[PDB]
UniProtKB/Swiss-Prot annotation, chain A:
GO cellular component: viral envelope
Protein known as: Matrix protein
Organism: Newcastle disease virus (strain Chicken/Australia-Victoria/32)
Residue intervals passing through the bilayer: none
UniProt similarity note: Belongs to the morbillivirus/respirovirus/rubulavirus M protein family.
Pfam families tied to this protein: Matrix_Paramyxo_C, Matrix_Paramyxo_N
The gene coding this protein: M
Subcellular location: Virion
Swiss-Prot record, chain B:
Family of this protein: Belongs to the morbillivirus/respirovirus/rubulavirus M protein family.
Nuclease among keywords: no
Native organism: Newcastle disease virus (strain Chicken/Australia-Victoria/32) (NDV)
Domain comment quoted from the record: Late-budding domains (L domains) are short sequence motifs essential for viral particle budding. They recruit proteins of the host ESCRT machinery (Endosomal Sorting Complex Required for Transport) or ESCRT-associated proteins. The matrix protein contains one L domain: a FPIV motif.
Subcellular locations according to the entry: Virion
Record's protein name: Matrix protein
Keywords, in A-Z order: Host-virus interaction, Viral budding, Viral budding via the host ESCRT complexes, Viral envelope protein, Viral matrix protein, Viral release from host cell, Virion
InterPro entries: Matrix_C, Matrix_N, Matrix_Paramyxo_C, Matrix_Paramyxo_N
Disulfide bonds: none
Annotated motif FPIV motif, positions: 16-19
Superkingdom field: Viruses
Functional description taken from the UniProt entry: The M protein has a crucial role in virus assembly and interacts with the RNP complex as well as with the viral membrane.
GO terms classed as biological process: viral budding via host ESCRT complex
Recorded name of the encoding gene: M
Primary subcellular site in the record, as a coarse category: virion
Length: 329, 354
């Protein structure tokens, strides 16, 4: 009965259970060099009478952390936005900002007056969106996150693809508990817990050497120490989109260096990792259920024929969560 | 040994887990099925290849039963698809279909850039050794593309992929030309984006949960796909600058024709009968053809098309501005319909003979 459950639309001018219409809502995560990252969520409608078409997410960029955050979230609802389909190598949603408040002028989207973004990642059901006709995007949810810019360093794509015979792929087996109404049609795609329901996400976060300087097998017993030394913490956030933040408290080997910032931090947008999980996290409050570090072979060909190793000597700290929305006032 | 609703096509079960939970009674077990699409017609080149796409299910071995999947540690997780590549077009194609059911395949999650599904080919018959996947012995593919619900797939455990549906497409290799990504990414202020507004009718039962993500209409349900297909000049030689009249004539002269296929996955086939300008030439093969895998264009539509029969409803050629920034502040032009190739559809499956 949280109103954000309607961000699952069409998988389900307003209505829901049970005040049977919904108000605008905001949430604010504090992860505190600080900026405030702004994500909005809402609905694509065909203007008629209005036919609700799909939920959608439009992230605006970031602004300095000054002023009353509640008042900033308020201003985000005063935008007027149109949208239309386009394509490049894949389908896009193009959002045109018709009007917006002054504080926002500073974020890339508003200054630019447009955002052309990957449709599958920002629209729940882009197949329900007509390729012509008069479409509008109405914001109902504002998600702000306060965090140092340096702390949401994204790993270059090329680094995440590096593979090699003499390397081990480091990954996280992440399970995420998700609050879902048992009769929701979303249950169908989740795993069933004894407590409720959860999503699986397998995330690549590092590389390690199969050998010690110039010689022998790394004892495969003691990759484990190297990993404990890394000292990982993992959390969830909305930083322009649901994302897994990972921190290494400990020093990094040379192979692991490009996988973290100079302050031991890495942000992994889920919509690149798993577009379907990301979209579930739009509508449901969610929390890390467990995080296991896994060592796999360092090429995909080898992964196919060789047993994964689960690292058991660690206990990953699980920290921040994707927080509940609240009405204004 | 999966059960399905005996009133519906067994391929509808490839939507799993997005299916109606109550499969009526009397449920009946799914049988293996295949289909063959002939594309011999569509060009002059000889039909030299058979492209093979399999579909089936991921199971976890060794908690959660239903009407569909009733077994122990044989738990049904998700539908999935595994493209194999191509073999030469020789001999009995039905027997080639059968051989695709005799493979043993395990699978596991992995990741690099994004989540992947890694399929290992443990055993495969001699007739398939030619195809890329079987000769490599594995395939690591993007998970959201090849698995209906990657989020229901565990990061460790014993998983198996069982093939139940085989889809063979007979076609000259020359013709099924995928436009390279860079070509698709070229943009410019002195350019127009040529695109297709594609609508696709899909046969679906109304109680199915799949319906929720489709557009509704008097005839039945459809999906919307917006596909980038070419580039044109905003300007002519010497003096600028091109009239709507003249764009419209260039497009009619191109004389496009569009259809559906499974070519290592649901795909839109495009044929141009007119010659191509300097700018448009990289977007078609030497015989005027292009193959667009829908799973790149619109991954969610591709996946609907695993499980439902479909055919084109309408294809309108659109021109938008040549940069995204300008698309945002300029109206599109809907220019004309393309021809629709009636022979080219996402076609029904059939059980094998006796």
């Amino acid at each position: 009965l949280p109103s954000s459950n309607l961000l699952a639309f069409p998988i389900v001018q307003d209505i829901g259970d049970g005040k049977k219409q919904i108000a605008p809502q905001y949430r604010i995560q504090r992860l505190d060099e600080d900026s405030v990252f702004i994500t909005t969520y809402g609905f694509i409608f065909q203007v008629g009478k209005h036919e609700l078409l799909s939920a959608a997410m439009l992230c605006l960029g970031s602004v300095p952390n000054v002023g009353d955050l509640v008042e900033l979230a308020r201003a985000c609802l005063t935008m007027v936005v149109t949208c239309k389909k386009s394509a490049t190598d894949t389908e896009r949603m193009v959002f045109s900002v018709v009007q917006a408040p002054q504080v926002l002028q500073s974020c890339r989207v508003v200054a630019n007056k447009y955002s052309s973004v990957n449709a599958v990642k920002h629209v729940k059901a882009p197949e329900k969106i007509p390729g012509s006709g008069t479409l509008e995007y109405k914001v109902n949810f504002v998600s702000l996150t306060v965090v140092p810019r340096k702390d949401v360093y994204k790993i270059p794509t090329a680094a995440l693809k590096v593979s090699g015979s003499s390397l081990y792929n480091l990954a996280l087996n992440v399970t995420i508990d998700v609050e879902v109404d048992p009769k929701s049609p979303l249950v169908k795609s989740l795993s069933k817990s004894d407590s409720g329901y959860y999503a699986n996400l397998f995330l690549h976060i590092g590389l390690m050497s199969t050998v010690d300087k110039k010689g022998k097998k790394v004892t495969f017993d003691k990759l484990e120490r190297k990993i404990r030394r890394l000292d990982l913490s993992v959390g969830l956030s909305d930083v322009l989109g649901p994302s897994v933040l990972v921190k290494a408290r400990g020093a990094r080997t040379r192979l692991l260096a490009p996988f973290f910032s100079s302050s031991g931090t890495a942000c992994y947008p889920i919509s690149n990792a798993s577009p379907q999980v990301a979209k579930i996290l739009w509508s449901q409050t969610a929390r890390l259920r467990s995080v296991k570090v896994i060592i796999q072979a360092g090429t995909q060909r080898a992964v196919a024929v060789t047993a994964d190793h689960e690292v058991t000597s660690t206990k990953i700290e699980k920290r921040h969560t994707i927080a509940k929305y609240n009405p204004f006032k």
